[PDB]
Design a protein around this ligand. Sequence first.
Ligand SMILES: Nc1ncnc2c1ncn2[C@@H]1O[C@H](COP(=O)(O)OP(=O)(O)O)[C@@H](O)[C@H]1O
Lengths: 370, 49, 37
Amino acid sequence: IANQPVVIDNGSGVIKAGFAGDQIPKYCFPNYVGRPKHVRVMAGALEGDIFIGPKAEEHRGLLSIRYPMEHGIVKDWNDMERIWQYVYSKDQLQTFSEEHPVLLTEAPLNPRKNRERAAEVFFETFNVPALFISMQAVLSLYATGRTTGVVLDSGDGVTHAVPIYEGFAMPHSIMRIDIAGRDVSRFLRLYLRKEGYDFHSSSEFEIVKAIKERACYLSINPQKDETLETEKAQYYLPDGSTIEIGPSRFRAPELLFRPDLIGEESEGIHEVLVFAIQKSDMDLRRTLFSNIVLSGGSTLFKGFGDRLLSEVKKLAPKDVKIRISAPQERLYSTWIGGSILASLDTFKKMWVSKKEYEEDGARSIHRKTF
Amino acid sequence: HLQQNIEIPEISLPIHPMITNVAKQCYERGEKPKVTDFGDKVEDPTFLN
Amino acid sequence: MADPKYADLPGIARNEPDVYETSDLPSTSVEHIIVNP
Ligand SMILES: Nc1ncnc2c1ncn2[C@@H]1O[C@H](COP(=O)(O)OP(=O)(O)O)[C@@H](O)[C@H]1O
């Protein structure tokens, strides 16, 4: 026995949510809380001091933004409860919580303590009847409806590649990199001070993030493309100010393939990705050549998959046809896939009742992990 | 029912008030309720729950 | 209103506008196939 569950597609930057069997996440709001810088002695103005969404984005000025979650590992768990309480807002739910099944998201390569504390929240502070969350890549595959695939997510500062054969991942061939657009914008901030500009405020930095997402693409041959002169079509701020560009429009996003240039013993998404592919079956790579699942919204770049095709030619196999799946609802793919799963009578076997948590809890977490 | 030894009485099935009122009004109109008789209330998971 | 209030003291923007103003002015295509043969 249950109610209609809700799929909460936790984007590393923007969390999303929405009831079962639907097509579009009901809510789409980010992951940070602002608190006012200035206080007042005046009587009659606003209250709250904790805002997320249009309230925060509305009056960004005093609300000092702080991202509580880092690579899934959140440190403001209490504030996450407040965030989920905000998910239970009047404008948000007006529903109950201890009487409905739900669905959140889970990326791999994580400490169990996160799931442990999560169960503590939803089953100590809440009394959720049944709830089970699994690997996000399968949800993307649900959106595809394709047995095998190479899913690559793209969070704000989180990325990971997973190959799955008919609903079976490869634990010995799954990789992850701790970065996405987060340090890309931070690196753009670096470029800003490289040519003398600081955008040290939190909101200011998110504005920089929006600028990045607004004007950035991929180049063909980076060192050869460096030989030209960027004309820097200046954009003009909401404040009304000159915005130069530099190589940032193409150089800054390729930091992903130059972690040594940023200071990290890593190689590249496609590099370690194809390495894990090499660790897979001699035969399944053939399937994965056409089964290339693109996911995550950080992927929005001109010639993104095209430069990725160039990367494929860099890591060329022994002449075998390859194909990439590049949909348009890559962020929504996981939410919709969960909605598909949430629209299944198979969750009876795929769930864990709260009574099970009452009986064991931690042991149910360890044993009934997946 | 006990005096009649019915062993169990036919307990009232709880039906929604607005649903009954809409069905009554539709019967006054001479036709059973339409598809979107509630309009966009179909997309209200609260009412659905 | 404050009309007799205005009759008492003289600090009223008489015959002058109270507002001044700077006037008006006039996709992700899939199938990236690396056909390698
Ligand atoms: N024009 C754009 N170019 C690149 N990335 C973008 C653009 N617009 C939005 N994004 C990205 O969409 C991504 C959504 O990330 P997130 O919701 O954290 O993904 P995930 O669901 O994989 O965690 C953000 O990382 C943000 O940088």
